[PDB]
Write a structure and sequence with these properties.
The structure is a homotrimer. The first copy, chain A, is an alpha+beta fold. In chain A, about 20% of the residues lie in helices and about 40% in strands. Chain A contains two helices and nine strands, in the order ββαβαββββββ. Chain A: It comes from Bdellovibrio bacteriovorus (strain ATCC 15356 / DSM 50701 / NCIMB 9529 / HD100).
Chain lengths: ~110, ~110, ~110
């Protein structure tokens, strides 16, 4: 159901996700990279589903698609299956001990 | 040739989608989302709730979670009354909006 | 077959999706959402607007609503100029962003 390099996440309506980088990347760069790879930054529920599946490693922070304000965006941290929310300015690349990784999601093919 | 899974209902607003009421009891945000994800769907976003209210699939005077955070600790709810909608927000652990219970509704794509 | 319906354009950015400018004059948030819902779609989200700007579908110096709320009374807008985007927020009844009319854009899934 997913293109080469993507993974079928079986939560909600199953979708396809991919960790796009191992480097800490800012918000706009994350979104643009994912858009160039035929996908989008995952929303809140897709992040929660990937965390519940174990697809996202424990204690990992990623940018989700929601804005916190005109100059900030929300991050989701995944640890031991549970999710927590935060936000940062568009230019931030490191959420405490975790570099903020870009994760792309897209529909089933 | 059914447009939805059994237990789900086609809402003809925007691109028609499939909605289902998960529970009749007030439920917090995290449990709402987890139950929707475990029922093959996800929490309805703002426009899906507006469509379900305009169609009448959501009865008058109904408060339900939507899939947008209000801050790191809160999420938005939508109240539906007399065919019109209004937005509010509440902490994750909250299960009640005034006299109304915050009910979980799930949405997914038309099949 | 055709990826989009008559009037809608396939946007080749992110998950490729069908889009349509719903009006040429400033429209408030609620009327924008209602027009989109009544014409088979919904207000585009943040990444859909960013893609439409990066592909050139959105002309330069264009402000449009998106589907996210900034609070219970306001919604976010995206302005596209050159290849780049910026985020603002305005009350539901606002029609103009500075000297830019707030235009409604509808988005939906392909095929």
């Amino acid at each position: 159901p997913c293109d080469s390099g993507w993974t079928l996440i079986n939560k909600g309506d199953p979708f396809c996700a991919k960790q796009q980088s191992v480097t800490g990347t800012n918000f706009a760069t994350s979104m643009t990279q994912c858009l160039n790879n035929g996908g989008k930054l995952c929303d809140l529920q897709e992040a929660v589903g990937m965390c519940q599946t174990g697809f996202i490693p424990s204690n990992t922070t990623l940018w989700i698609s929601q804005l916190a304000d005109n100059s900030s965006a929300h991050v989701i941290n995944c640890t031991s299956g549970s999710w927590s929310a935060g936000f940062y300015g568009f230019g931030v690349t490191v959420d405490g001990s975790n570099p903020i990784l870009p994760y792309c999601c897209k529909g089933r093919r």
